Design an enzyme around this catalytic site. Structure first.
Site, PDB file in Angstrom:
ATOM      1  N   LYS A  68     -19.529  96.507 -20.116  1.00 51.06           N
ATOM      2  CA  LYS A  68     -18.515  97.506 -20.420  1.00 51.06           C
ATOM      3  C   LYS A  68     -17.427  96.913 -21.302  1.00 51.06           C
ATOM      4  O   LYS A  68     -17.009  95.762 -21.118  1.00 51.06           O
ATOM      5  CB  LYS A  68     -17.866  98.063 -19.152  1.00 51.06           C
ATOM      6  CG  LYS A  68     -17.153  99.411 -19.358  1.00 51.06           C
ATOM      7  CD  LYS A  68     -16.215  99.752 -18.182  1.00 51.06           C
ATOM      8  N   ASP A  94      -7.635 104.941  -8.700  1.00 55.88           N
ATOM      9  CA  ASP A  94      -8.445 105.653  -9.685  1.00 55.88           C
ATOM     10  C   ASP A  94      -9.894 105.187  -9.688  1.00 55.88           C
ATOM     11  O   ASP A  94     -10.633 105.488 -10.635  1.00 55.88           O
ATOM     12  CB  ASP A  94      -7.851 105.533 -11.096  1.00 55.88           C
ATOM     13  CG  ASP A  94      -8.149 106.740 -11.975  1.00 55.88           C
ATOM     14  OD1 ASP A  94      -8.637 107.785 -11.470  1.00 55.88           O
ATOM     15  OD2 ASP A  94      -7.888 106.633 -13.194  1.00 55.88           O
TER      16      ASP A  94
END
Lengths: 309, 309
Positions: free
Chosen positions: A102, A230
């Site tokens: 990522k 989150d």
């Protein structure tokens, strides 16, 4: 792609270098502030897919060497997985589907540095048994004017068993649903409201569910200490019958797999884990300028408990 | 020593990189102006014998890749010879005695660049059969404030057969003799007057001597075209009997060996070749400020002819 080439070259280089260091059992404080930089300049010596001027930096190589071994990963396997053939876009996946690559911001890199020692300590305390992301390597890539940062993790999903349905769960009291546009994808990332309104059952036995939930509790409590939030529970479902048109897996490669119980209406294997943890509370507030960390913690753990019910 | 470490690391790196390029049969003009640079910075990542900040530059990697193969040298063998174990001081010798590693000035590096293409062309024309130095690699090494240049050559002497007597011959009408101090060394580098006054015979048969002298003629003529001078004929003598207290060698590893003829008074193998050619005429005049190129040519070829008589 040329950045991918640098990543492959760099990972190959990094692991070959470490293969010579003698690895102690422990890390020193300075291991968490260390890095390895290479800068290559080739003049009129043009290679095949290799850029002729690039930079490659590995953060904290000894910490991630230590983590990889704690996660059961041999360095030579890691090397091959990332260098025998190019990773595929999808983030990127290693050609053998074992690791995820990522692209993150320099702000995420700063936050990873900021939690790396507490993270490592937590991984030591739980003997590498956790639903948290397994951070395996972090790098900086430069090719002629482009700088990107990558972090490499173990894939939540199986490397062999295909996932036919994927959920991204948060427990947020806010309206979380996949889009009518998004639900048109082939692997839609469905959301809380999807799962809840569509009566998704996770058929795992009671011992599997108690073990899972206790892991989840310790993991999320730890994230809450760090004032992180989150993050999601990622849920992949492998349908044994749809694949056959046999459902066994190596729990030592597919470490997040949980087989369904023996009265499941359909032969299913579940892959569940926490993903995307690097949002610090104040990172989200800055992006929102373009929900406290404990609140997220509570609403999350409550929801997943209700999910599995 | 730390510079040696960089040399070993760099040679290992250079050959591994080339193992991926597809090598064409030809060189392009730009191959003679090319280079490969690596700069390594390790911060709080201290290795065993490796400096933590160093630079490594390879000049014209494709030319020297081409030369090595023309000289019969496989890249993997070259790599092992220079990296499995450290070179030994004596210049340096590879641990297996096959290659020589000499430290040269940036001025020599400039002159090597200046003749590399004509040199390569000459090596092509003679099919790699020459008494000239076999240039195998040229590099720049930096460790924290020290910069050195190395050039790597094939060893004139055998890798197995010990040399008991060595001569450095020039043919200079000037007084060339080893010193009473120098003659006290274990392998004295004796000189022209040594050889001449001490009645040294080289017992090689007439065909060996005609072949040798014709090679020498073409080689020295070529050096003279380049306005080079101050080069020597290096002569090593291996005494088979003194070694036993059996005299066969691989003329494909020990490429400068010439067995003695069958009535030699003692079983001897000779190793002869031109060394130290990079003195341009004007380089010698500058150092002398601290003998024309053809004159050197004539006095040299005449003398060696008299040597072998």
């Amino acid at each position: 792609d040329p950045l991918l080439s640098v990543l492959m070259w760099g990972v190959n280089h990094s692991i070959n270098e470490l293969s010579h260091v003698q690895i102690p059992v422990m890390l020193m404080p300075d291991d968490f502030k260390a890095y390895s930089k290479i800068k290559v300049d080739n003049h009129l010596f043009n290679k095949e897919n290799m850029p002729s001027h690039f930079k490659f930096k590995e953060y904290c190589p000894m910490v991630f060497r230590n983590l990889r071994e704690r996660f059961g990963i041999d360095d030579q396997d890691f090397q091959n997985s990332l260098t025998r053939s190019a990773p595929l876009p999808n983030f990127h996946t290693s050609y053998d589907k074992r690791y995820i690559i990522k692209t993150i911001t320099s702000e995420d890199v700063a936050e990873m540095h900021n939690i790396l020692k507490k993270y490592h300590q937590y991984i030591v305390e739980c003997h590498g048994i956790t639903l948290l992301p397994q951070f395996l390597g972090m790098y900086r890539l430069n090719v002629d004017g482009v700088e990107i940062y990558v972090i490499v993790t173990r894939n939540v999903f199986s490397h062999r068993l295909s996932v036919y349905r994927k959920y991204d769960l948060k427990g947020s009291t806010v309206a979380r649903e996949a889009s009518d546009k998004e639900k048109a994808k082939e692997l839609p990332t469905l959301k809380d409201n999807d799962f809840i309104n569509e009566g998704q059952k996770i058929y795992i036995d009671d011992n599997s569910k108690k073990v899972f939930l206790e892991k989840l509790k310790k993991d999320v409590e730890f994230l809450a200490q760090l004032k992180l939030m989150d993050y999601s529970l990622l849920v992949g479902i492998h349908d044994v019958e749809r694949a056959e048109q046999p459902g066994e897996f190596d729990p030592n490669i597919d470490v997040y797999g949980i087989k369904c119980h023996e009265n499941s209406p359909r032969k299913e294997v579940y892959f569940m884990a926490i993903i995307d943890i690097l949002t610090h509370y104040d990172a989200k507030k800055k992006a929102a300028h373009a929900v406290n960390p404990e609140q997220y913690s509570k609403r999350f753990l409550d929801f997943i408990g209700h999910i599995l019910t």
